[PDB]
Amino acid sequence: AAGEAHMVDVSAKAETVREARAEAFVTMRSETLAMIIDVFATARIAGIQAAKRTWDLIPLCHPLMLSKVEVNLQAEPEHNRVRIETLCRLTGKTGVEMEALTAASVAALTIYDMCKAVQKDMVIGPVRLLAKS
Amino acid sequence: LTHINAAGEAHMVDVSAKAETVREARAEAFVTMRSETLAMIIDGRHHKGDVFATARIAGIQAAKRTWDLIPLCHPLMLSKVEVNLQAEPEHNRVRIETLCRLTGKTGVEMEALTAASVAALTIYDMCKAVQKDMVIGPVRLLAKSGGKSGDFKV
Amino acid sequence: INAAGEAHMVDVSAKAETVREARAEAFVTMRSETLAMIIDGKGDVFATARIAGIQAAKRTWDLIPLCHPLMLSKVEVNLQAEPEHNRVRIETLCRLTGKTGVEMEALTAASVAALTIYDMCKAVQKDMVIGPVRLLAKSG
Amino acid sequence: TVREARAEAFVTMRSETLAMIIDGRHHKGDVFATARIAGIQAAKRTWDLIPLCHPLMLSKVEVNLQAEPEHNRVRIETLCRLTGKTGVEMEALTAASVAALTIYDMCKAVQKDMVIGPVRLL
Amino acid sequence: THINAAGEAHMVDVSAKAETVREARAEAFVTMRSETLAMIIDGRHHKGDVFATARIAGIQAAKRTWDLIPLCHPLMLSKVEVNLQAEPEHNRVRIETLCRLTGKTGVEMEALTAASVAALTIYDMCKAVQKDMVIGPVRLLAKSGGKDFK
Amino acid sequence: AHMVDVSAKAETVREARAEAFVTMRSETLAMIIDGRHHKGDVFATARIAGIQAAKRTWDLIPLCHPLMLSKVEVNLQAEPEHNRVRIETLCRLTGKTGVEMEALTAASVAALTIYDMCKAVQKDMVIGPVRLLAKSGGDFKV
Ligand SMILES: Nc1nc2c(c(=O)[nH]1)N[C@H]1C(=O)[C@H]3OP(=O)(O)OC[C@H]3O[C@H]1N2
Ligand SMILES: Nc1nc2c(c(=O)[nH]1)N[C@H]1C(=O)[C@H]3OP(=O)(O)OC[C@H]3O[C@H]1N2
Ligand SMILES: Nc1nc2c(c(=O)[nH]1)N[C@H]1C(=O)[C@H]3OP(=O)(O)OC[C@H]3O[C@H]1N2
Ligand SMILES: Nc1nc2c(c(=O)[nH]1)N[C@H]1C(=O)[C@H]3OP(=O)(O)OC[C@H]3O[C@H]1N2
């Protein structure tokens, strides 16, 4: 299949409570954790906002109505990093995997934008998902 | 020394004073998967379609919404965007390399990273029916130009 | 200052799917001459304010960080000239069948229509005032 | 309550122009892929483009592109489908129009007087 | 072409080009039955003022051209005009738009998008009455960018 | 021609200051300071929200021009004595177009967020007044 974009038909599916949790990391130098925590709130909003626009960022995703989005951030001085864990949930025909992965990635991008001045090079990753319902 | 105000609060830094130079930034991303997961990409056997073309466009579009995605960034006019997708069977991964350039007052690290991130999120969306536990990463910056701040390479 | 840097979105999967409704209002006070500009010399002006408020309401989830994305079933925005008060009254109506109310949509519809009217008359009068913006009714 | 709608659009050009889409096999490459992605994206934003439309939860968006050298044009056909309270006509026409516009943008450099139309429901 | 030698899709760097006042005119048509055209004129379509609704829809679609059309450059429009006119002799509505800015890349897509989106809107207003409407033709009338046309 | 042809105007430093108020009951203004509003950090969310709104003004107000902002600041300040939150925004850029709508939209969406963050507690909060404080680019203040 060359040059084609097919969107999966979800009409036939049942309405179920679906759920997904992803995680993402922003690794940096130890000092670069000079930390205000509303720096996290900016990143927290960015993930929630990204989660709600996922159908618009990912070309083949469905418009969905999220029941809840939560974005948590943790600083791990022992590992030189910020840990993010996301949670998206709805009751519909479509899972919320991409929403969580997007919400974690953009929260990660946001922290990079906030600290980009101190360290030119920081490493975002890994980005993956813990479990889904 | 941040994207934050003097008080512990969020504002938008005034960039107007600085010099307007041609700026550039290149970033990279990796999508780690199974050998079988990468093999259906080369064969075009994922039911969702052309995975690289879709990830190419998505990142390009992602690039232009960066100021709109990253809450505090300045609106910018990208002059050039390149999103490169490459298959690496030997490491079980797709390597992604992006390139953003414009003539403005504020840097372009975020546009290049964002383009790289969504191309990765897209490649994931396109193949996730086959493998649910793929790993996105690392996401890094490879170079930056035009900035008054410390320029950077490799 | 507890809960600092924190952003919780209320969970709504537990609520019942019912028809929910919200009415909001807004006023834009101006000089009488500015209010005479619209009525005497109103369609192109009220329409812009009408449309802007309707599309704005359809974007409330994009504007209010912690609001739910919902699918609006009806959006009505009426504009009224009130010469006795040197002002323009806006009244909006939002309604759908879902788990989330449509309060913010109705409020946003009113706010943006207000801002739209402000932009339209901004050249004639510098010091126009928007307010009050308050909610009129809710059913849910 | 499965509802469905299909639209179509044409982007008429010179036979020389339509050959740049196929003699580089771009037609089953990125050029058609872009118009296909654009139209799908546009269809999911019909409510944001057309003032009096409702936001809808689409079950499917299809954008098929086919070259008709025989008529000097690219034929476009769209398909929108959902299970809900609102038909999806505007979504199909929007997907159809924007998908045609992307193709104009692609070949805009080659020909300055390309013509889009007709755009109609099926 | 507007894509890569690779056959890859990319956005071309146009920064080297001069910063000139570019302009674009496009026209578009929406053919309907005579009664449907008259309900626009009498303003008896229940949704509301069709031309005014379409005008605004077109203006705003123009400001979103780079965000709708995937490979186009982000631009800052200086002026957008959206003109609506009924032509009873042809059973149709004629749309004529105007875009212009001081930039390094043209504004054709901005005018064409405005014409199509004003046309989609006119369709959406009158759709309840008629499902037979045909949009077209949609074409470019002029360009005075740095890359002259008419 | 209701969308004004902004080119060609002089490229000048343009600035705008706007203000807005969200009146509430003292328990509501108290749970903001306590930060016992369930949705979260109210001022942060309203501060971020107002800022993005400034960058989206061109897309919300039909006849406004697309522009590129340089500075957006959103001030939230609690006024227990007046049972209200005062918002003051400041928008600046260098271009051909003024920034009044941005400052006003930012102030308005920040107000709308504050309403969103506290509305579970109080349904009858009242947003107003929303006005311009200053624009520089002739000049105006007061
Ligand atoms: N917004 C959004 N749209 C989606 C998916 C998604 O995760 N988010 N998964 C895609 C899939 O591959 C399938 O996964 P799923 O979770 O089984 O649900 C059906 C499909 O939805 C598809 N469309
Ligand atoms: N788009 C949108 N999203 C919303 C609310 C809203 O008014 N509009 N209210 C918020 C609430 O506090 C709750 O109020 P509610 O009326 O119980 O409805 C559910 C919730 O929706 C929440 N998210
Ligand atoms: N997104 C979207 N919104 C719409 C319509 C539509 O086709 N798409 N039709 C409009 C109509 O006039 C009616 O068409 P319909 O197919 O009868 O369904 C209900 C109405 O939805 C209205 N709003
Ligand atoms: N984004 C944006 N677009 C705008 C204005 C604005 O404040 N923001 N002012 C509007 C005006 O009324 C005029 O004000 P001005 O500051 O004289 O500049 C020209 C016009 O730009 C208009 N478009």
Side-chain angles (χ1 to χ4, degrees):
Chain A
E4 298 179 2
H6 299 297
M7 182 173 173
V8 177
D9 200 335
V10 298
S11 328
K13 295 174 170 294
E15 289 184 347
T16 321
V17 181
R18 300 166 181 265
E19 197 182 18
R21 302 175 186 87
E23 81 172 358
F25 296 91
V26 183
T27 302
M28 45 186 172
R29 290 181 290 190
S30 61
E31 323 275 37
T32 331
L33 295 71
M35 19 84 129
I36 306 290
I37 310 318
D38 48 28
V39 47
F40 273 8
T42 305
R44 206 176 302 262
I45 303 297
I48 296 181
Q49 290 283 80
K52 300 184 297 182
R53 296 176 296 179
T54 309
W55 57 268
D56 183 80
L57 289 171
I58 309 301
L60 268 50
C61 274
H62 294 65
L64 301 179
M65 291 178 54
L66 293 163
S67 296
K68 156 135 84 171
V69 183
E70 102 185 14
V71 173
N72 281 284
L73 305 117
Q74 301 154 253
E76 298 177 345
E78 349 305 312
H79 299 99
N80 294 324
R81 65 187 184 184
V82 174
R83 177 178 182 272
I84 316 178
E85 176 174 345
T86 59
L87 170 61
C88 296
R89 183 186 307 158
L90 55 71
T91 57
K93 302 180 175 325
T94 308
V96 290
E97 303 172 345
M98 300 316 288
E99 279 69 21
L101 282 171
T102 299
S105 302
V106 175
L109 284 173
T110 303
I111 292 183
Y112 190 101
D113 183 41
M114 305 287 281
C115 306
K116 60 169 186 170
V118 175
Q119 202 177 331
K120 236 43 228 212
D121 191 275
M122 277 185 266
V123 181
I124 295 181
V127 182
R128 46 138 136 143
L129 98 100
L130 329 179
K132 86 221 135 138
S133 151
Chain B
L1 41 86
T2 26
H3 209 337
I4 199 82
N5 203 331
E9 295 166 355
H11 86 297
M12 182 164 315
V13 50
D14 179 354
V15 191
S16 326
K18 332 201 308 181
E20 182 180 295
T21 58
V22 178
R23 295 168 172 264
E24 191 176 6
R26 336 181 327 88
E28 77 166 8
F30 295 89
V31 185
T32 305
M33 59 187 61
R34 300 163 154 179
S35 58
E36 312 88 312
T37 311
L38 184 49
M40 296 175 50
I41 283 176
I42 314 176
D43 297 15
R45 289 174 69 181
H46 287 293
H47 46 86
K48 273 213 169 64
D50 193 327
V51 292
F52 277 6
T54 304
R56 262 191 299 273
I57 314 305
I60 290 180
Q61 289 193 125
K64 299 187 299 178
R65 304 171 192 169
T66 307
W67 59 270
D68 188 35
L69 283 170
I70 316 296
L72 266 50
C73 275
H74 297 72
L76 297 121
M77 295 171 55
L78 291 171
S79 156
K80 181 181 184 177
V81 172
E82 245 159 46
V83 175
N84 300 120
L85 284 313
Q86 279 342 105
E88 293 178 346
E90 25 292 324
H91 298 101
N92 292 328
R93 68 187 179 187
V94 177
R95 180 175 183 272
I96 319 179
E97 174 175 58
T98 55
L99 174 58
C100 295
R101 179 192 305 166
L102 50 72
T103 62
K105 296 289 195 183
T106 183
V108 286
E109 308 96 330
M110 302 306 305
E111 281 69 23
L113 293 166
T114 305
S117 303
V118 170
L121 288 173
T122 297
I123 290 183
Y124 190 106
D125 178 48
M126 303 284 289
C127 308
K128 65 187 191 66
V130 171
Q131 179 179 2
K132 69 181 179 181
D133 59 322
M134 286 177 293
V135 172
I136 302 181
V139 180
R140 273 186 320 148
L141 194 68
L142 295 187
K144 182 184 175 178
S145 308
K148 116 171 189 184
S149 178
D151 296 323
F152 164 67
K153 187 187 164 56
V154 84
Chain C
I1 323 162
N2 142 29
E6 221 155 329
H8 308 298
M9 185 172 177
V10 50
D11 196 337
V12 81
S13 358
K15 278 185 169 55
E17 187 140 50
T18 179
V19 42
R20 299 172 179 267
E21 197 183 21
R23 294 173 180 78
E25 79 170 4
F27 295 88
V28 179
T29 301
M30 54 190 64
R31 288 189 304 264
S32 56
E33 315 173 45
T34 312
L35 184 49
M37 289 264 300
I38 296 169
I39 334 190
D40 294 7
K42 33 213 213 338
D44 258 327
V45 179
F46 277 5
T48 311
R50 197 179 311 269
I51 302 300
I54 291 182
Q55 299 200 244
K58 294 186 293 182
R59 299 177 197 166
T60 298
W61 60 268
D62 187 40
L63 287 178
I64 313 297
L66 266 50
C67 273
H68 292 70
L70 41 75
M71 303 305 176
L72 284 170
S73 304
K74 296 292 179 295
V75 178
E76 286 184 348
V77 174
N78 288 329
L79 288 309
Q80 178 66 263
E82 296 181 343
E84 352 150 288
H85 303 282
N86 291 323
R87 65 184 185 180
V88 182
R89 177 171 184 263
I90 320 184
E91 177 175 338
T92 68
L93 171 55
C94 295
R95 181 194 310 157
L96 56 73
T97 53
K99 304 188 184 70
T100 62
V102 285
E103 298 179 353
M104 295 306 301
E105 282 75 26
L107 288 167
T108 297
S111 300
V112 173
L115 292 174
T116 299
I117 291 183
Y118 191 101
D119 181 40
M120 304 283 293
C121 317
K122 197 199 315 96
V124 182
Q125 188 178 4
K126 33 195 273 179
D127 62 339
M128 287 172 275
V129 188
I130 304 182
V133 175
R134 70 161 118 134
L135 195 66
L136 293 185
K138 184 192 183 175
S139 129
Chain D
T1 172
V2 40
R3 306 175 182 205
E4 174 174 302
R6 312 177 192 87
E8 76 165 15
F10 296 91
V11 182
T12 306
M13 57 193 64
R14 289 188 296 264
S15 189
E16 300 88 333
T17 314
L18 186 49
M20 294 184 57
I21 307 185
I22 230 167
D23 296 345
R25 295 224 347 181
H26 297 159
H27 69 301
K28 296 295 179 355
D30 278 22
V31 168
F32 279 18
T34 304
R36 188 171 295 106
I37 288 295
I40 289 179
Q41 292 284 74
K44 298 186 293 180
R45 276 187 290 172
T46 302
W47 61 271
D48 190 34
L49 287 176
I50 314 301
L52 292 183
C53 277
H54 303 79
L56 297 181
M57 290 180 58
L58 293 166
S59 302
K60 187 184 280 179
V61 183
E62 288 185 346
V63 176
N64 294 282
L65 293 310
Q66 177 140 39
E68 300 176 347
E70 32 171 300
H71 299 65
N72 298 328
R73 68 190 185 185
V74 181
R75 177 171 187 271
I76 318 184
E77 177 170 345
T78 59
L79 168 59
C80 298
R81 182 187 307 166
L82 52 70
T83 61
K85 295 183 175 310
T86 310
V88 284
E89 339 204 327
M90 293 308 303
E91 283 70 31
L93 286 175
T94 298
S97 299
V98 176
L101 287 174
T102 303
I103 287 184
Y104 188 107
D105 181 50
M106 291 300 190
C107 314
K108 172 169 50 62
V110 178
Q111 186 175 357
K112 311 169 177 27
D113 60 325
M114 289 178 293
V115 174
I116 296 184
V119 187
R120 76 216 162 96
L121 214 82
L122 267 24
Chain E
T1 152
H2 250 78
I3 35 95
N4 221 311
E8 279 197 337
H10 82 303
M11 187 178 302
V12 189
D13 194 339
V14 298
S15 178
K17 293 168 57 188
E19 180 184 4
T20 60
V21 180
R22 299 174 172 265
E23 199 183 15
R25 296 179 53 194
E27 74 170 1
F29 296 90
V30 182
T31 298
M32 58 193 62
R33 289 192 297 264
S34 62
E35 308 91 316
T36 297
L37 182 51
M39 297 181 63
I40 304 178
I41 305 182
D42 295 338
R44 207 23 63 173
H45 277 287
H46 312 290
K47 292 204 176 192
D49 195 329
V50 179
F51 280 6
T53 303
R55 201 182 314 268
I56 299 302
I59 293 179
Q60 284 189 143
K63 298 188 296 184
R64 288 178 244 174
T65 298
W66 59 264
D67 190 33
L68 292 174
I69 320 298
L71 272 63
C72 283
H73 303 73
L75 290 178
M76 295 171 57
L77 288 164
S78 299
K79 197 191 203 306
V80 179
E81 289 184 354
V82 181
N83 296 127
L84 287 312
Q85 183 171 41
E87 298 180 346
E89 44 276 41
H90 301 93
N91 296 327
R92 65 184 185 182
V93 176
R94 176 175 182 270
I95 318 180
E96 182 169 348
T97 68
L98 174 62
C99 298
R100 119 180 184 158
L101 50 71
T102 66
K104 342 189 69 181
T105 182
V107 287
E108 305 190 13
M109 297 310 305
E110 285 71 15
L112 291 166
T113 297
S116 303
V117 178
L120 291 172
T121 304
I122 292 182
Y123 189 100
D124 180 49
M125 307 296 276
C126 328
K127 48 193 281 272
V129 169
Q130 229 208 297
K131 298 89 175 186
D132 246 16
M133 273 159 310
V134 177
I135 309 181
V138 182
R139 64 184 174 97
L140 194 68
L141 290 182
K143 178 191 179 181
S144 80
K147 294 162 56 182
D148 180 304
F149 168 99
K150 178 127 112 35
Chain F
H2 223 346
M3 180 174 174
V4 190
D5 197 344
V6 69
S7 60
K9 289 175 57 166
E11 91 184 12
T12 175
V13 42
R14 300 172 180 268
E15 193 182 302
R17 300 176 55 196
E19 76 168 0
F21 294 84
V22 185
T23 303
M24 56 194 60
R25 284 189 289 261
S26 60
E27 301 86 318
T28 307
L29 185 47
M31 296 184 64
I32 296 180
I33 305 180
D34 297 351
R36 296 259 149 187
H37 279 305
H38 348 293
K39 283 202 175 65
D41 176 349
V42 183
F43 281 16
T45 306
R47 201 172 304 109
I48 302 298
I51 293 177
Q52 294 191 122
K55 302 189 298 178
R56 299 173 189 171
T57 296
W58 62 272
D59 196 287
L60 285 169
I61 316 297
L63 267 48
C64 279
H65 297 71
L67 43 76
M68 299 181 304
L69 286 155
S70 295
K71 158 184 274 298
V72 177
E73 116 183 356
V74 177
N75 294 328
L76 293 317
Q77 234 75 34
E79 296 182 347
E81 57 281 359
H82 300 113
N83 288 328
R84 66 187 181 186
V85 183
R86 179 173 186 271
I87 318 181
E88 178 172 354
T89 62
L90 175 63
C91 291
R92 168 187 302 150
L93 66 119
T94 71
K96 17 189 60 180
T97 329
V99 210
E100 22 238 330
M101 285 327 287
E102 275 69 24
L104 287 165
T105 305
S108 301
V109 174
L112 289 175
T113 307
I114 293 181
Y115 189 106
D116 177 53
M117 304 290 287
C118 309
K119 65 189 195 64
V121 173
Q122 185 174 3
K123 68 193 174 183
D124 62 319
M125 283 176 293
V126 177
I127 296 181
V130 183
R131 59 185 170 99
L132 193 67
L133 290 183
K135 79 195 155 127
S136 319
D139 293 325
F140 160 65
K141 287 177 178 33
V142 85

